[PDB]
Design an enzyme around this catalytic site. Structure first.
Site, PDB file in Angstrom:
ATOM      1  N   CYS A 107      62.641 -33.342  31.091  1.00 30.95           N
ATOM      2  CA  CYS A 107      63.376 -33.146  29.845  1.00 30.95           C
ATOM      3  C   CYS A 107      63.095 -31.703  29.389  1.00 30.95           C
ATOM      4  O   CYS A 107      62.060 -31.441  28.777  1.00 30.95           O
ATOM      5  CB  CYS A 107      62.924 -34.173  28.798  1.00 30.95           C
ATOM      6  SG  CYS A 107      63.859 -33.956  27.239  1.00 30.95           S
ATOM      7  N   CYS A 110      62.780 -31.298  25.428  1.00 31.79           N
ATOM      8  CA  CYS A 110      61.743 -31.998  24.677  1.00 31.79           C
ATOM      9  C   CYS A 110      60.735 -32.792  25.508  1.00 31.79           C
ATOM     10  O   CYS A 110      59.659 -32.292  25.882  1.00 31.79           O
ATOM     11  CB  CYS A 110      62.250 -32.815  23.447  1.00 31.79           C
ATOM     12  SG  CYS A 110      63.454 -34.006  23.940  1.00 31.79           S
ATOM     13  N   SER A 111      61.002 -34.071  25.707  1.00 33.79           N
ATOM     14  CA  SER A 111      59.976 -34.919  26.328  1.00 33.79           C
ATOM     15  C   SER A 111      60.534 -36.258  26.796  1.00 33.79           C
ATOM     16  O   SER A 111      59.768 -37.133  27.270  1.00 33.79           O
ATOM     17  CB  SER A 111      58.788 -35.178  25.366  1.00 33.79           C
ATOM     18  OG  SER A 111      59.282 -35.570  24.072  1.00 33.79           O
ATOM     19  N   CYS A 112      61.855 -36.394  26.714  1.00 36.39           N
ATOM     20  CA  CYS A 112      62.511 -37.654  27.054  1.00 36.39           C
ATOM     21  C   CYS A 112      62.073 -38.233  28.400  1.00 36.39           C
ATOM     22  O   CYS A 112      62.012 -37.543  29.427  1.00 36.39           O
ATOM     23  CB  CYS A 112      64.003 -37.451  27.066  1.00 36.39           C
ATOM     24  SG  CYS A 112      64.362 -36.518  25.587  1.00 36.39           S
TER      25      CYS A 112
HETATM   26 CO   LIG Z   1      62.651 -35.135  25.582  1.00 38.86          CO
END
Ligand SMILES: [Co+2]
Lengths: 203, 228
Positions: A107, A110-112
């Site tokens: 991601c 972000c961090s998905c």
């Molecule tokens: Co993310």
């Protein structure tokens, strides 16, 4: 790396701890956060939801070609056949490693990450070092960071999770495992193998 | 929304820090930050797209080096102030109080069954963002498209490294909440969603890996025929 401007980790933690306790106290007074709610969220992602769930899916696909077809067709629905699904995996798309293709997921924004099958992501996945480099130099990154050499003639596909589609890698079944039980096979499946940064475990 | 958080393709960020193992939560404050997500969502502080935009507005040096769950704290405070649910002055005073008195109690409160029910239902039932719309998809598998060069200040999912790049449609998924509107408080306004394949040479230039591609998800307004 070194940043001469940066406080010690101890000081940073002391400050964050006070800030969070302050915010916590205010949300508690608003009636929207409670100690049991906090404890329940922690318990789910410490002990209930984690990569053993994705491992069950992988080994079913390895040992059941029809299920594997359903999993690649609609990951959410196949996983629900096993009672696996929910928050941050409402829309899963599984992608199949082969002799011709290697997949890795990121991601960048972000961090998905697919919580229902892998639990919460490890910190390196959420950090900018992995995120910045894997879309740009994935072959070199797999080699240098994970000791995983993908020969130059083999295609690498990097899946950037910019939407709520959550990509999960179905790693190839290691050689030497013919007729193994689902339980034995699951001992070879790692979260890293379902991110695409390592193959499933050999031998 | 050209923030530093949009790191795909950025050089010089350093080696990966990957300890041999790690706990899910490294400290009790992280458990609190984490559980504050369903709490503030239920209470109407923000939806998911707005949550992300709050993090995107952080000081970028703080973003790059702070513990992950600190980002979450910043976006709760951002939206608490935006909606008038958090008084900044009171938060500052309480922060100093808990600096000085770290073992002071939390406020007395009642437990609420409905919050446990909310957590279980969100975790195991999910918060699906798929929606039905009245228009059919504009694009289909095999279409060659160009990604927009627009550069909105507000929230979007337009990574700088794909802007203006061509690519081939690889899969239509159906319609979903549209971040440009949702993350800026303008509602779901759902749009069809596509995965698009971009070659490494298209993204990174003539010296790119000829055997690598990046798959990136594009809502319909993000792409037009690059005209094939
Ligand atoms: Co993310």
């Amino acid at each position: 790396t070194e940043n001469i401007l940066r406080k010690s980790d101890e000081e940073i933690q002391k400050e964050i701890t006070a800030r969070v306790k302050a915010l916590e106290s205010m949300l508690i007074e608003q009636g929207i956060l409670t100690t049991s709610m906090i404890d329940r969220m922690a318990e789910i992602y410490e002990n209930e939801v984690g990569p053993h769930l994705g491992a069950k899916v992988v080994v079913k696909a390895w040992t059941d070609p029809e299920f594997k077809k359903r999993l690649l067709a609609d990951g959410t629905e196949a996983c629900k056949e096993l009672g696996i699904g929910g928050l941050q995996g409402e829309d899963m798309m599984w992608v199949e490693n082969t002799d011709e293709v290697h997949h890795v997921v990121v991601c960048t924004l972000c961090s998905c990450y697919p919580w229902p099958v892998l639990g919460l992501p490890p910190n390196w996945f959420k950090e900018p070092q992995y995120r910045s480099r894997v879309v740009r130099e994935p072959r070199q990154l797999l080699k240098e960071e994970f000791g995983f050499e993908v020969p130059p003639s083999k295609e690498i596909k990097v899946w950037d999770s910019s939407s709520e589609m959550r990509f999960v890698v179905l790693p190839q079944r290691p050689a030497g495992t013919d007729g193994w039980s689902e339980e034995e096979l699951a001992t070879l499946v790692t979260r890293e193998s379902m991110i695409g940064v390592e193959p499933a475990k050999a031998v | 929304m050209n923030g530093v958080y949009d790191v795909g393709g950025t050089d010089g960020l350093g080696p990966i820090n990957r300890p041999a193992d790690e706990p899910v939560f490294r400290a009790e404050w992280e458990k609190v930050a984490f559980a504050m997500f369903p709490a503030t969502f239920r209470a109407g502080f923000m939806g998911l797209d707005e949550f992300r935009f709050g993090i995107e507005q952080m000081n970028p040096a703080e973003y790059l080096e702070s513990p992950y769950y600190w980002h979450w704290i910043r976006t709760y405070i951002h939206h608490g102030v935006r909606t008038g649910k958090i008084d900044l002055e009171e938060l500052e005073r309480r922060t100093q109080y808990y600096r000085e008195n770290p073992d002071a109690p939390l406020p007395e409160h009642e437990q609420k069954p409905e919050l446990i029910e909310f957590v279980n239902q969100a975790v195991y039932g999910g918060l699906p963002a798929s929606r039905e719309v009245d228009r059919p998809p504009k694009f289909k598998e095999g279409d060659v498209v160009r990604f927009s060069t627009a550069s909105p200040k507000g929230h979007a999912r337009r990574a700088r490294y794909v802007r203006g790049k061509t690519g081939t449609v690889v899969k239509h998924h159906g319609a979903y909440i549209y971040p440009d509107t949702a993350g800026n408080g303008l509602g779901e306004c759902p749009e069809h969603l596509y995965t698009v394949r971009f070659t490494a040479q298209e993204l990174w230039g003539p010296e790119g890996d000829p055997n690598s591609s990046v798959y990136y998800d594009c809502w319909e307004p993000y792409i037009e025929l690059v005209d094939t």
